[PDB]
Amino acid sequence: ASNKSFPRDWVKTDPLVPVLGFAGWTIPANIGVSAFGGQSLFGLFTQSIGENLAHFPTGPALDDKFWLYLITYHLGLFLTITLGQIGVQGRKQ
Amino acid sequence: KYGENSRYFDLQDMENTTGSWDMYGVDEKKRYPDNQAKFFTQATDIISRR
Amino acid sequence: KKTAAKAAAPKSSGVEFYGPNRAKWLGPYSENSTPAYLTGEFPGDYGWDTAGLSADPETFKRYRELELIHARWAMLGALGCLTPELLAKNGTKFGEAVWFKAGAQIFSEGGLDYLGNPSLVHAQNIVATLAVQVILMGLIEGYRVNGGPAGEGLDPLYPGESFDPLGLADDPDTFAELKVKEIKNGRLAMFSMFGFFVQAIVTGKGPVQNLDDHLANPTVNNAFAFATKFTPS
Amino acid sequence: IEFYGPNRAKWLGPYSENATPAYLTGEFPGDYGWDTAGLSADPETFKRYRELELIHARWAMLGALGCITPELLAKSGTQFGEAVWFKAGAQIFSEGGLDYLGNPSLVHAQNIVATLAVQVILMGLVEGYRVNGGPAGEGLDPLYPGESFDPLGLADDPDTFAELKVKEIKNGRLAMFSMFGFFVQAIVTGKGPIQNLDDHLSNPTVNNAFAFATKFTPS
Amino acid sequence: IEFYGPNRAKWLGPYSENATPAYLTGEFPGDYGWDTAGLSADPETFKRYRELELIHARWAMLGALGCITPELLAKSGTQFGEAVWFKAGAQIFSEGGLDYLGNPSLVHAQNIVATLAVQVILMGLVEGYRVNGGPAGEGLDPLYPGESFDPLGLADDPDTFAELKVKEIKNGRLAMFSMFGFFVQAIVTGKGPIQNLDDHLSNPTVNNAFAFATKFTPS
Amino acid sequence: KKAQVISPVNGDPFVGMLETPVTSAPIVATYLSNLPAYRTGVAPVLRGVEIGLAHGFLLAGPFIKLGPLRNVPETAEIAGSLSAAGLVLILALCLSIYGSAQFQSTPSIGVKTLSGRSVARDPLFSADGWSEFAAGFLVGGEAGVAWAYVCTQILPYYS
Numbered sequence: 012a013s014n015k016s017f018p019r020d021w022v023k024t025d026p027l028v029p030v031l032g033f034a035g036w037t038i039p040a041n042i043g044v045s046a047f048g049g050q051s052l053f054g055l056f057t058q059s060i061g062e063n064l065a066h067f068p069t070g071p072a073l074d075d076k077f078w079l080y081l082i083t084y085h086l087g088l089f090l091t092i093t094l095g096q097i098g099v100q101g102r103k104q
Numbered sequence: 105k106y107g108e109n110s111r112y113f114d115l116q117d118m119e120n121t122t123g124s125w126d127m128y129g130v131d132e133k134k135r136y137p138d139n140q141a142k143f144f145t146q147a148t149d150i151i152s153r154r
Numbered sequence: 155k156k157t158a159a160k161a162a163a164p165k166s167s168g169v170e171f172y173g174p175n176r177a178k179w180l181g182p183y184s185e186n187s188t189p190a191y192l193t194g195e196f197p198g199d200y201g202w203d204t205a206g207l208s209a210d211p212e213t214f215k216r217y218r219e220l221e222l223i224h225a226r227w228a229m230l231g232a233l234g235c236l237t238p239e240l241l242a243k244n245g246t247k248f249g250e251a252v253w254f255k256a257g258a259q260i261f262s263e264g265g266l267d268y269l270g271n272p273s274l275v276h277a278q279n280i281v282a283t284l285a286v287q288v289i290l291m292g293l294i295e296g297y298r299v300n301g302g303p304a305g306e307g308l309d310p311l312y313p314g315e316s317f318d319p320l321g322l323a324d325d326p327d328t329f330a331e332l333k334v335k336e337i338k339n340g341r342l343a344m345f346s347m348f349g350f351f352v353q354a355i356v357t358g359k360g361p362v363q364n365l366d367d368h369l370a371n372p373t374v375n376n377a378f379a380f381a382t383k384f385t386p387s
Numbered sequence: 388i389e390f391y392g393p394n395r396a397k398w399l400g401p402y403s404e405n406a407t408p409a410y411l412t413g414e415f416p417g418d419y420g421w422d423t424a425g426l427s428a429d430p431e432t433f434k435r436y437r438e439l440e441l442i443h444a445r446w447a448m449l450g451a452l453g454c455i456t457p458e459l460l461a462k463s464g465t466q467f468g469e470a471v472w473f474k475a476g477a478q479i480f481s482e483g484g485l486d487y488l489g490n491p492s493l494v495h496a497q498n499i500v501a502t503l504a505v506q507v508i509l510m511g512l513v514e515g516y517r518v519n520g521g522p523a524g525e526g527l528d529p530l531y532p533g534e535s536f537d538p539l540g541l542a543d544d545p546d547t548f549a550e551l552k553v554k555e556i557k558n559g560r561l562a563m564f565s566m567f568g569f570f571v572q573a574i575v576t577g578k579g580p581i582q583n584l585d586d587h588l589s590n591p592t593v594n595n596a597f598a599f600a601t602k603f604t605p606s
Numbered sequence: 607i608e609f610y611g612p613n614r615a616k617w618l619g620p621y622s623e624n625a626t627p628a629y630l631t632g633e634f635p636g637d638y639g640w641d642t643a644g645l646s647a648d649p650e651t652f653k654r655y656r657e658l659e660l661i662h663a664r665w666a667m668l669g670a671l672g673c674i675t676p677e678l679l680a681k682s683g684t685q686f687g688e689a690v691w692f693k694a695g696a697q698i699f700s701e702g703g704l705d706y707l708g709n710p711s712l713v714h715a716q717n718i719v720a721t722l723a724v725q726v727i728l729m730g731l732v733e734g735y736r737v738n739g740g741p742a743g744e745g746l747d748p749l750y751p752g753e754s755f756d757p758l759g760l761a762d763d764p765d766t767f768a769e770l771k772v773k774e775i776k777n778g779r780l781a782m783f784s785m786f787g788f789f790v791q792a793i794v795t796g797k798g799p800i801q802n803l804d805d806h807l808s809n810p811t812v813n814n815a816f817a818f819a820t821k822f823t824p825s
Numbered sequence: 826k827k828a829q830v831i832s833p834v835n836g837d838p839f840v841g842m843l844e845t846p847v848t849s850a851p852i853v854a855t856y857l858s859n860l861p862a863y864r865t866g867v868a869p870v871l872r873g874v875e876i877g878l879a880h881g882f883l884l885a886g887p888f889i890k891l892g893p894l895r896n897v898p899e900t901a902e903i904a905g906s907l908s909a910a911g912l913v914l915i916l917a918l919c920l921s922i923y924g925s926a927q928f929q930s931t932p933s934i935g936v937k938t939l940s941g942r943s944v945a946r947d948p949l950f951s952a953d954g955w956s957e958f959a960a961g962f963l964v965g966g967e968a969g970v971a972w973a974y975v976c977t978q979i980l981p982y983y984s
């Protein structure tokens with residue numbers, strides 16, 4: 012029917028799905044637009060990650076212009092990997 | 105035979121055809137270092153009853 | 155949970171120990187089906203026989219008798235160079251949590267103050283520390299090569315006896331896997347220790363402190379900023 | 388003059404001790420029979436050593452010519468900045484990146500991490516395709532391919548080709564030893580090796596080596 | 607007391623692990639069975655290691671006695687200048703060449719390059735004739751010749767001769783380790799090793815080793 | 826297209842469970858095999874003390890931080906720990922009377938493992954085994970809550 016036993020490999024690990032995921036999304040994620048004044052969406056909150064890593068135990072402020080960077084960065088990072096994994100065209104496309 | 109080409113309901117082999125499996129139950133010994141058997145079974149000797 | 159059906163010798167697991175392993179190069183793997191001396195059967199074989207320093211079967215064994223010991227030392231070496239640089243940055247006094255003068259603290263005020271607490275071991279002698287190290291370690295590694303109490307010496311790579319409290323050491327396919335998680339994590343510990351050592355030579359700050367400095371400015375605070383140091387002239 | 392045979396130019400010449408180790412008797416270039424420790428007794432490991440020595444020899448020859456050329460070119464009629472091979476690696480940091488030929492109309496590499504990443508990519512590609520073959524015909528020989536890497540066609544006549552093999556190996560050994568000399572001159576005196584050349588040609592015996600012999604004195 | 611046999615004094619004694627590697631079981635001096643890495647599995651390479659270790663041991667023993675004698679002689683009743691083995695190599699440069707015994711009636715070597723060239727010539731001759739034999743009878747044994755190098759004749763009785771072999775090897779191992787100690791003392795404290803001896807005998811525990819433990823601190 | 830992940834249980838589409846990477850993934854399966862409630866070869870007393878040590882130590886917390894004595898210093902820990910010990914006591918009583926009600930009659934008939942072989946019945950599922958498990962739970966839970974107090978009093982940067 013569907014199957015008779017659960018296959019113990021279901022995520023077929025193709026090793027260059029993740030490296031192309033974040034490597035092929037972050038090398039164009041740090042270009043530099045007019046929009047930020049010459050900064051990236053990977054270096055402008057590198058400043059932030061290190062910045063509130065300085066004063067360590069203080070959890071950063073709940074309105075601090077970098078939660079936006081965290082959320083909008085992962086909103087694309089996860090998407091590019093989840094569309095990379097459907098780059099298993101081994102039998103479909 | 106039960107585990108075959110869609111031949112279910114083996115009459116003499118009831119514990120497969122019924123749905124009585126141990127899903128996650130392993131059974132082996134030596135989970136603990138030995139003398140906690142001593143230190144805890146000689147400790148719960150009093151209250152080991154109903 | 156299903157009993158991994160062994161029945162045979164191979165140990166495939168996912169894909170780890172057979173002819174089709176996972177090699178090192180993604181298309182330029184070892185020529186002619188990987189050099190003929192090593193075709194699986196053991197944890198940690200990937201195929202770097204490029205210098206070929208081990209072609210005899212006894213050397214293939216004796217180098218691995220090094221490997222597992224070396225890796226296990228590096229695991230505790232890594233964690234034992236990580237822990238108090240975190241703890242001192244949180245809330246705990248130590249003297250100096252940096253792993254250069256961690257050994258020099260005996261000379262400082264009164265010996266070794268443990269966790270910043272003046273109610274503990276307080277080792278004032280270096281000489282007694284030397285004595286206990288030599289004596290107890292020479293005993294223990296004598297027992298490693300011979301086999302004495304608390305379990306006899308059966309396999310010098312993996313004894314697997316009353317030493318293990320969990321008693322996991324029964325199903326052999328899951329440890330065809332876990333003998334390899336060992337070596338993967340141990341080579342991670344090896345190169346983390348080279349991080350410790352070469353960062354120790356070049357800049358002389360703690361490895362945690364190197365991570366903090368790097369993440370404060372990843373493009374500026376990295377190895378290349380030390381590149382003009384150590385130049386003759 | 389008979390390297391391919393029992394009458395090769397042995398490691399001591401007329402002190403040859405003609406009882407040579409039997410696991411190499413000619414038939415391969417560079418076999419000079421000097422095995423005092425014998426770390427290449429096994430044949431497959433010996434093959435690995437032939438391949439490894441060839442790779443080392445070619446890389447070291449390239450490095451040696453790269454250590455002779457730019458200093459002479461900047462001494463003759465051009466300017467590079469620091470043509471000496473020490474700070475040529477730091478020419479990207481100084482003021483305006485690494486300008487090739489000392490000219491702001493050439494490479495002008497500003498960021499060294501871009502060179503870094505592209506270098507890793509290209510070097511992984513070429514080394515992998517070096518091991519297992521690939522473009523310009525699949526690699527069938529790990530030692531000397533014979534495919535489209537000789538666009539002039541000098542590998543037709545066999546004995547001259549073998550003589551070329553022996554010259555290649557000898558040049559590589561000399562290049563490796565000379566680059567070791569370059570590194571030791573880098574350590575001890577830390578000045579230009581061709582500056583060393585000019586200074587020793589100007590001073591043949593007054594500043595030879597042992598004025599620079601009391602520098603690394605422990606105390 | 608049974609080195610030539612299965613009952614030799616093994617590398618851990620009664621932690622012996624009497625499952626010793628089978629490629630050495632007695633029959634050669636110094637076989638203490640301590641092969642943790644096993645870099646001498648091959649038999650001809652093992653022979654090379656026996657010869658090499660013998661050469662190293664004799665050279666190191668000679669150097670060790672050369673490091674003990676002159677300082678004591680200049681401390682007792684003579685003067686050399688710098689009897690400590692550091693600047694004994696630089697005694698030719700200082701004022702009047704290298705005067706032997708600190709006396710201007712002995713060697714008085716002015717130019718070090720003459721010592722250099724004659725030393726190379728003599729050393730090449732003696733090492734070539736060491737390998738392949740030559741004078742005083744042609745060399746038939748590479749390990750221990752038995753020809754006219756024993757003018758007293760102590761090599762008649764075999765078991766005492768084998769005991770002498772084992773003593774020679776043990777003395778050589780001790781000499782090598784002790785000269786390593788001499789070199790490390792040359793690095794760390796950079797003073798006289800017998801000055802070290804006198805200072806540690808005068809100061810047994812107050813200046814032991816770890817006053818000299820914060821010298822090579824990186825920063 | 827000739828690829829499927831979700832399967833019925835051990836073939837057999839007519840038992841009301843179906844296998845998913847939530848239930849029958851390998852790491853999840855080995856994880857829930859290694860928990861103390863599924864080991865079957867150990868004596869139930871020891872399981873009792875392991876489970877009790879875990880649950881008491883976790884139960885102590887919320888009474889400490891959120892109890893009615895949480896602002897008065899140095900005694901906010903005492904009232905919390907005491908109340909948690911009380912809760913563990915009541916859990917022990919519940920285990921005892923469950924033993925008195927559940928295993929009071931005949932057991933079942935048969936049991937096999939998933940990769941079929943006839944495994945024997947777990948000795949935790951008899952009256953004696955369950956009572957011993959309850960005693961182990963009491964000991965372990967009280968020891969755990971006492972350890973929670975101990976751990977509060979000597980701990981580097983507790984707050």
Ligand code: CLA
Binds near residue numbers: 208
């Ligand atoms: C002391 C540690 C040690 C030892 C004894 C060995 C021994 C061995 N390894 Mg192993 N290995 C090690 C560390 C070590 N390795 C580390 C850290 C890694 C991760 C990179 C690996 C990864 C690895 C793989 C993936 C494979 C082996 C293999 C082998 C076997 C044959 C290869 C050989 O001849 O190397 C002999 C090794 C030595 C003689 C050690 C040389 C040490 C000197 C000082 C040179 C090292 C300096 C270094 C290269 C300079 C740069 C340092 C920088 C990279 C940090 C042999 C059993 C093959 C095998 O059979 O699998 C088990 C194989 O497929 N190894």
Ligand code: CLA
Binds near residue numbers: 411437443560
């Ligand atoms: C790493 C470089 C390297 C390597 C792998 C080899 C490899 C080889 N050489 Mg070779 N050689 C080299 C550099 C090298 N050579 C250089 C630079 C010279 C010129 C001095 C020579 C001169 C030479 C001669 C004259 C002969 C060989 C021969 C051989 C073969 C057998 C010897 C052997 O097993 O070597 C194994 C070598 C190694 C494992 C390298 C170990 C390196 C470590 C770091 C020790 C080096 C320390 C060094 C002695 C200190 C001074 C350095 C200074 C001299 C540069 C083998 C293919 C013999 C042969 O038959 O040719 C085919 C032979 O007759 N070589």
Ligand code: CLA
Binds near residue numbers: 636640644655659786
């Ligand atoms: C270079 C010097 C040298 C060489 C070639 C040898 C050679 C040998 N020794 Mg030996 N040994 C030496 C010095 C040396 N020894 C010294 C100084 C000591 C005293 C510490 C010993 C103590 C010793 C014992 C107790 C035993 C041997 C044995 C052997 C034989 C087998 C081991 C082997 O393959 O070694 C190969 C050796 C090398 C390839 C040398 C590598 C050197 C590099 C630089 C690494 C050294 C780094 C070092 C560990 C760091 C600390 C140095 C400090 C301890 C001095 C072989 C003939 C065994 C045997 O059967 O005897 C016949 C045996 O049981 N040796």
Ligand code: CLA
Binds near residue numbers: 887888891892893894
């Ligand atoms: C259901 C909603 C609700 C909630 C959240 C609370 C919450 C609270 N009440 Mg409360 N209360 C409620 C309804 C509720 N009340 C109602 C309806 C009444 C009237 C009948 C009362 C009457 C009342 C009184 C009279 C008092 C409280 C008090 C309290 C406080 C302490 C209680 C305590 O010690 O907890 C004990 C803590 C537990 C039982 C913890 C169990 C929960 C664990 C943490 C769940 C963990 C789940 C986890 C995620 C699972 C992960 C699994 C994974 C690991 C695999 C606390 C703030 C007391 C106080 O002083 O307030 C400040 C107090 O005196 N309440």
Ligand code: CLA
Binds near residue numbers: 888893908909912
């Ligand atoms: C008439 C019935 C009755 C009575 C007398 C009480 C009495 C009490 N309730 Mg309560 N309650 C009741 C019904 C009742 N409840 C009902 C029906 C509900 C549900 C709606 C609740 C829900 C409720 C909540 C949610 C809370 C209480 C709490 C309390 C305590 C508040 C006293 C105080 O200020 O904290 C002082 C508290 C202490 C000093 C701790 C004493 C702990 C026990 C009594 C001692 C145990 C001794 C020890 C464990 C024995 C050792 C055993 C050995 C094996 C080691 C008090 C004991 C609070 C409480 O205790 O939780 C923290 C609380 O938060 N009640």
Ligand SMILES: CC1=C[C@H](O)CC(C)(C)[C@H]1/C=C/C(C)=C/C=C/C(C)=C/C=C/C=C(C)/C=C/C=C(C)/C=C/C1=C(C)C[C@H](O)CC1(C)C
Binds near residue numbers: 450454
């Ligand atoms: C044989 C034998 C035998 C016996 O038995 C034993 C023994 C003795 C041990 C042995 C020996 C051995 C040896 C000697 C070895 C050596 C080697 C070498 C020298 C190498 C080099 C090697 C070397 C090499 C590669 C090199 C390379 C180089 C390069 C890339 C370079 C680069 C560069 C350039 C361009 C320029 C710039 O501006 C910079 C640089 C960066 C600088």
Ligand SMILES: CC1=C[C@H](O)CC(C)(C)[C@H]1/C=C/C(C)=C/C=C/C(C)=C/C=C/C=C(C)/C=C/C=C(C)/C=C/C1=C(C)C[C@H](O)CC1(C)C
Binds near residue numbers: 644785
């Ligand atoms: C066995 C084994 C095994 C395992 O398996 C592994 C391992 C561990 C690796 C191995 C080991 C090894 C080792 C340890 C080695 C060592 C060696 C040595 C020490 C040498 C010396 C060696 C040394 C030597 C020769 C020396 C020599 C010397 C000399 C000539 C001297 C001279 C002099 C004099 C007279 C005086 C003057 O005024 C100066 C001088 C100049 C000073």
